């Protein structure tokens, strides 16, 4: 089993790098949840021009109160412009600290449990996420799920 | 011999085809879930809408044809519902809701509500809604998944009609 | 149980009308992956196969494992497909020309198939129709898992 | 560049599944094909650019594969295979083969294939799922290029 965790860590790191290149996003990361649905940016591919947010811990009220239940039942986040969208102010402030203009966040499941998020950020400017891109990030999060379960 | 897709859709009588299918679906979903009401809320271009299809236990007042000017939908144009948001409330009396929305639900005799999006391509077309009117109802995870999956098939039927 | 069975009989009836198929049926597997036509909507022009029991070698040998991993059947014209002769003769006995069959899953189990037949003639199943019958089978699966 | 992306994927899939070879078999108009992309352990022959005229695929135009058919063979010596097919695999040093379809919209564009070359291999249900889900993501990449 040693080192299958290093093998998963290499695999998730390669995946976020290829997804960021393919979608031409500024940042792609994995947000991994703890037991209480706080979490940490576990994996990040970021264009050198921008803040690396790797290992930033986030205590998000929405995830910690719902324990991600809506994301197990098909809710996800597609925001073209964080200024446009009616976000709770402190959540918008967190995204601005991350330099975020646009965000796409889809779930990574283990069975019936939310393990984490796969997240694309546009940092340069607003971005209208297309149907195929949302579908692509969701399908990549399924690949990640299978890999995580089997390591 | 080869099956052709004409399907007699040039007939004025086939306008009500989609309405008949949707009426059968809400009737059968109400019985299967043993809900007091199942209805379709159809949106207009400004994301006001109407209760377009309803199955309701005859005890309760019919809300069929009720027009609703919902601030959340009219302000968002249903963008969060296009991206999979839904409502699943066991007890609307105890829930943290805006009071004017609670009052609308109370006027509909609602104690519990499960409301999921219906899409037509990339557009929010409507909501599929189950109500418990007799008393509160803890909606199960499988019932949320059920009603979402029923709305997927209804979205296909709306697209292909 | 009556409530589930009514939902299933209504479903094959409505699916048959919507797709303009000649037959729509549920094939329910037994423990040996033999099966029964358990639910059927058919035009009166054609023979009812409701309650027919089928001992299909492909299903009995695989126990439907390929169907749990995304294989399904979409045949426009059984007379031009390259079918095992004893399966083609079963389909001929059912007056089949075109067949679309998708799995009904109960968790990880292949519980059955949701099946559309064209009997009048061949039929090129469209991508949307395949996706539609798969999504209707997911509705049926969710219900059967909870009844 | 799509070819860079497909090469990265077969390379990382091969490492993750610990296969001896992962490649893409890309179909021509007549459902002949060529290995277009290959990650192989240097111990074994490279089959990159090999053109194959496959009787099953050219006759069926891979319709069963458009509809989810796949091949999971633990041991090509103890599999009920047409000898000219078992002979194509032996030529490639294959012992075990997992092959799943790659779709471009509704067309069968190619296959994503894992070979074990060292010895036989009991493919696991999760691996069939993993490789099919890689093929889904590839299909989307291919369609949008
Ligand atoms: C104020 C109390 C803040 C707070 C509470 C809320 N957060 C909310 C939504 C939320 N949080 C996330 C998490 C991330 N997105 C990312 O890119 C990263 C880093 C990669 C993280 C950690 C998402 C995706 C969402 C939206 C979920 C959804 O679909 O609703 C909300 C409710 C929604 C809103 O109005 O914003 C509240 C309230 N979070 C904070 O961090 C501070 C403490
Ligand atoms: C006050 C101005 C009222 C109002 C505005 C709001 N609607 C809100 C949310 C909402 N609306 C619906 C709609 C329905 N539920 C149904 O059963 C039917 C009919 C069958 C309809 C049309 C839903 C499902 C939701 C929940 C949205 C969500 O957040 O997921 C809200 C905010 C919600 C809250 O916090 O309570 C407001 C404000 N609607 C009115 O008609 C009056 C004018
Ligand atoms: C010979 C031994 C016969 C036999 C065996 C085989 N069946 C095969 C495939 C198969 N069977 C089914 C079942 C149905 N089709 C229906 O309409 C209904 C009723 C509504 C049933 C029960 C399906 C869907 C398939 C196709 C599976 C696939 O995708 O391959 C096969 C191999 C397939 C082939 O022909 O190439 C064999 C062999 N069935 C019999 O009853 C006799 C005994
Ligand atoms: C004889 C004429 C040979 C031949 C014909 C056949 N091919 C058959 C099936 C088939 N072909 C493939 C293709 C590949 N597998 C690979 O690893 C690669 C390269 C990376 C290729 C191109 C697969 C996966 C299958 C199996 C299909 C299935 O699921 O059945 C068959 C019949 C299959 C059987 O044995 O049942 C014949 C006959 N191909 C040749 O090139 C020679 C000339």
mmCIF file of N, CA and C in Angstrom, chain B residues 1-3 5 7-8 20-21 24 28-29 31-32 34 142 145-146 149-150 152-153 156-157 160-161, chain C residues 3 6-7 10 14 18 20 118 120-123 126 128-129 131-132 135-136 138-139 142-143 146-147:
data_model
loop_
_atom_site.group_PDB
_atom_site.id
_atom_site.type_symbol
_atom_site.label_atom_id
_atom_site.label_comp_id
_atom_site.label_asym_id
_atom_site.label_seq_id
_atom_site.Cartn_x
_atom_site.Cartn_y
_atom_site.Cartn_z
ATOM 1 N N UNK B 1 -41.992 0.701 -44.240
ATOM 2 C CA UNK B 1 -41.881 -0.159 -43.009
ATOM 3 C C UNK B 1 -41.134 0.654 -41.959
ATOM 4 N N UNK B 2 -40.066 1.348 -42.396
ATOM 5 C CA UNK B 2 -39.112 2.106 -41.538
ATOM 6 C C UNK B 2 -39.904 3.136 -40.726
ATOM 7 N N UNK B 3 -39.680 3.187 -39.416
ATOM 8 C CA UNK B 3 -40.475 4.055 -38.513
ATOM 9 C C UNK B 3 -40.174 5.523 -38.834
ATOM 10 N N UNK B 5 -40.999 9.806 -38.016
ATOM 11 C CA UNK B 5 -41.145 10.547 -36.738
ATOM 12 C C UNK B 5 -42.277 11.562 -36.839
ATOM 13 N N UNK B 7 -45.433 11.167 -36.525
ATOM 14 C CA UNK B 7 -46.167 10.876 -35.255
ATOM 15 C C UNK B 7 -47.504 11.648 -35.195
ATOM 16 N N UNK B 8 -48.048 12.106 -36.346
ATOM 17 C CA UNK B 8 -49.334 12.838 -36.425
ATOM 18 C C UNK B 8 -49.273 14.180 -35.703
ATOM 19 N N UNK B 20 -51.454 16.282 -21.450
ATOM 20 C CA UNK B 20 -51.976 14.963 -21.014
ATOM 21 C C UNK B 20 -50.887 14.148 -20.335
ATOM 22 N N UNK B 21 -49.706 14.067 -20.934
ATOM 23 C CA UNK B 21 -48.568 13.303 -20.346
ATOM 24 C C UNK B 21 -48.197 13.872 -18.963
ATOM 25 N N UNK B 24 -50.781 12.959 -16.414
ATOM 26 C CA UNK B 24 -50.670 11.552 -15.988
ATOM 27 C C UNK B 24 -49.506 11.410 -15.011
ATOM 28 N N UNK B 28 -49.668 10.048 -11.099
ATOM 29 C CA UNK B 28 -48.996 8.803 -10.672
ATOM 30 C C UNK B 28 -47.935 9.084 -9.609
ATOM 31 N N UNK B 29 -47.191 10.175 -9.719
ATOM 32 C CA UNK B 29 -46.171 10.514 -8.696
ATOM 33 C C UNK B 29 -46.888 10.769 -7.350
ATOM 34 N N UNK B 31 -49.605 9.482 -6.146
ATOM 35 C CA UNK B 31 -50.057 8.191 -5.587
ATOM 36 C C UNK B 31 -48.839 7.433 -5.088
ATOM 37 N N UNK B 32 -47.775 7.386 -5.879
ATOM 38 C CA UNK B 32 -46.590 6.606 -5.504
ATOM 39 C C UNK B 32 -45.956 7.183 -4.227
ATOM 40 N N UNK B 34 -47.440 9.068 -2.087
ATOM 41 C CA UNK B 34 -48.520 9.337 -1.094
ATOM 42 C C UNK B 34 -48.372 10.768 -0.564
ATOM 43 N N UNK B 142 -33.935 9.286 -0.915
ATOM 44 C CA UNK B 142 -34.365 8.558 -2.131
ATOM 45 C C UNK B 142 -35.513 9.316 -2.792
ATOM 46 N N UNK B 145 -34.080 12.219 -4.841
ATOM 47 C CA UNK B 145 -33.470 11.619 -6.057
ATOM 48 C C UNK B 145 -34.577 11.195 -7.014
ATOM 49 N N UNK B 146 -35.645 10.589 -6.497
ATOM 50 C CA UNK B 146 -36.824 10.194 -7.300
ATOM 51 C C UNK B 146 -37.413 11.401 -8.039
ATOM 52 N N UNK B 149 -35.184 12.804 -10.675
ATOM 53 C CA UNK B 149 -35.120 11.931 -11.863
ATOM 54 C C UNK B 149 -36.428 12.046 -12.649
ATOM 55 N N UNK B 150 -37.587 12.146 -11.991
ATOM 56 C CA UNK B 150 -38.869 12.355 -12.700
ATOM 57 C C UNK B 150 -38.777 13.659 -13.479
ATOM 58 N N UNK B 152 -36.108 15.063 -14.777
ATOM 59 C CA UNK B 152 -35.209 14.796 -15.940
ATOM 60 C C UNK B 152 -36.048 14.270 -17.118
ATOM 61 N N UNK B 153 -36.850 13.239 -16.878
ATOM 62 C CA UNK B 153 -37.681 12.611 -17.941
ATOM 63 C C UNK B 153 -38.730 13.591 -18.439
ATOM 64 N N UNK B 156 -37.116 15.955 -20.914
ATOM 65 C CA UNK B 156 -36.962 15.265 -22.227
ATOM 66 C C UNK B 156 -38.294 15.327 -22.976
ATOM 67 N N UNK B 157 -39.408 15.023 -22.314
ATOM 68 C CA UNK B 157 -40.742 15.048 -22.943
ATOM 69 C C UNK B 157 -41.080 16.461 -23.424
ATOM 70 N N UNK B 160 -39.111 17.289 -26.639
ATOM 71 C CA UNK B 160 -39.378 16.430 -27.811
ATOM 72 C C UNK B 160 -40.836 16.620 -28.224
ATOM 73 N N UNK B 161 -41.606 17.441 -27.514
ATOM 74 C CA UNK B 161 -43.014 17.777 -27.844
ATOM 75 C C UNK B 161 -43.048 19.120 -28.586
ATOM 76 N N UNK C 3 -48.834 -0.361 -5.280
ATOM 77 C CA UNK C 3 -48.508 1.050 -5.688
ATOM 78 C C UNK C 3 -47.323 1.082 -6.678
ATOM 79 N N UNK C 6 -48.523 -0.506 -10.130
ATOM 80 C CA UNK C 6 -49.365 0.460 -10.869
ATOM 81 C C UNK C 6 -48.456 1.511 -11.499
ATOM 82 N N UNK C 7 -47.453 1.964 -10.768
ATOM 83 C CA UNK C 7 -46.544 2.987 -11.312
ATOM 84 C C UNK C 7 -45.841 2.355 -12.544
ATOM 85 N N UNK C 10 -48.437 1.860 -15.620
ATOM 86 C CA UNK C 10 -48.667 3.203 -16.171
ATOM 87 C C UNK C 10 -47.437 3.621 -16.968
ATOM 88 N N UNK C 14 -47.328 4.764 -20.854
ATOM 89 C CA UNK C 14 -46.980 6.137 -21.265
ATOM 90 C C UNK C 14 -45.716 6.166 -22.125
ATOM 91 N N UNK C 18 -45.478 7.689 -25.967
ATOM 92 C CA UNK C 18 -44.550 8.810 -26.191
ATOM 93 C C UNK C 18 -43.544 8.458 -27.296
ATOM 94 N N UNK C 20 -44.025 6.100 -29.516
ATOM 95 C CA UNK C 20 -44.748 5.467 -30.662
ATOM 96 C C UNK C 20 -44.114 4.114 -30.986
ATOM 97 N N UNK C 118 -40.056 -2.326 -31.882
ATOM 98 C CA UNK C 118 -40.839 -2.017 -33.072
ATOM 99 C C UNK C 118 -41.133 -3.377 -33.732
ATOM 100 N N UNK C 120 -43.774 -3.527 -36.446
ATOM 101 C CA UNK C 120 -44.300 -3.231 -37.814
ATOM 102 C C UNK C 120 -43.150 -3.246 -38.829
ATOM 103 N N UNK C 121 -41.922 -2.973 -38.383
ATOM 104 C CA UNK C 121 -40.804 -2.677 -39.276
ATOM 105 C C UNK C 121 -39.566 -2.245 -38.516
ATOM 106 N N UNK C 122 -38.454 -2.037 -39.222
ATOM 107 C CA UNK C 122 -37.203 -1.667 -38.588
ATOM 108 C C UNK C 122 -37.277 -0.214 -38.103
ATOM 109 N N UNK C 123 -36.408 0.114 -37.173
ATOM 110 C CA UNK C 123 -36.413 1.451 -36.523
ATOM 111 C C UNK C 123 -34.996 1.757 -36.041
ATOM 112 N N UNK C 126 -32.950 6.719 -32.100
ATOM 113 C CA UNK C 126 -32.204 8.003 -32.033
ATOM 114 C C UNK C 126 -31.495 8.142 -30.693
ATOM 115 N N UNK C 128 -31.447 10.579 -28.587
ATOM 116 C CA UNK C 128 -32.321 11.106 -27.510
ATOM 117 C C UNK C 128 -33.251 10.017 -26.961
ATOM 118 N N UNK C 129 -33.749 9.143 -27.822
ATOM 119 C CA UNK C 129 -34.642 8.041 -27.422
ATOM 120 C C UNK C 129 -33.914 7.056 -26.497
ATOM 121 N N UNK C 131 -31.318 7.771 -24.626
ATOM 122 C CA UNK C 131 -31.046 8.518 -23.362
ATOM 123 C C UNK C 131 -32.352 8.565 -22.571
ATOM 124 N N UNK C 132 -33.477 8.768 -23.261
ATOM 125 C CA UNK C 132 -34.799 8.834 -22.623
ATOM 126 C C UNK C 132 -35.157 7.502 -21.962
ATOM 127 N N UNK C 135 -33.075 6.994 -18.861
ATOM 128 C CA UNK C 135 -33.514 7.872 -17.735
ATOM 129 C C UNK C 135 -34.821 7.355 -17.151
ATOM 130 N N UNK C 136 -35.748 6.838 -17.970
ATOM 131 C CA UNK C 136 -36.978 6.213 -17.451
ATOM 132 C C UNK C 136 -36.639 4.963 -16.629
ATOM 133 N N UNK C 138 -33.974 4.563 -14.846
ATOM 134 C CA UNK C 138 -33.398 5.080 -13.562
ATOM 135 C C UNK C 138 -34.550 5.448 -12.624
ATOM 136 N N UNK C 139 -35.603 6.085 -13.141
ATOM 137 C CA UNK C 139 -36.848 6.350 -12.362
ATOM 138 C C UNK C 139 -37.375 5.023 -11.793
ATOM 139 N N UNK C 142 -34.986 3.612 -9.047
ATOM 140 C CA UNK C 142 -35.127 4.378 -7.776
ATOM 141 C C UNK C 142 -36.368 3.870 -7.050
ATOM 142 N N UNK C 143 -37.496 3.712 -7.740
ATOM 143 C CA UNK C 143 -38.772 3.284 -7.134
ATOM 144 C C UNK C 143 -38.656 1.851 -6.616
ATOM 145 N N UNK C 146 -37.077 1.069 -3.260
ATOM 146 C CA UNK C 146 -37.791 1.754 -2.143
ATOM 147 C C UNK C 146 -39.224 1.254 -2.045
ATOM 148 N N UNK C 147 -39.404 -0.061 -2.243
ATOM 149 C CA UNK C 147 -40.705 -0.779 -2.388
ATOM 150 C C UNK C 147 -40.429 -2.294 -2.452
#
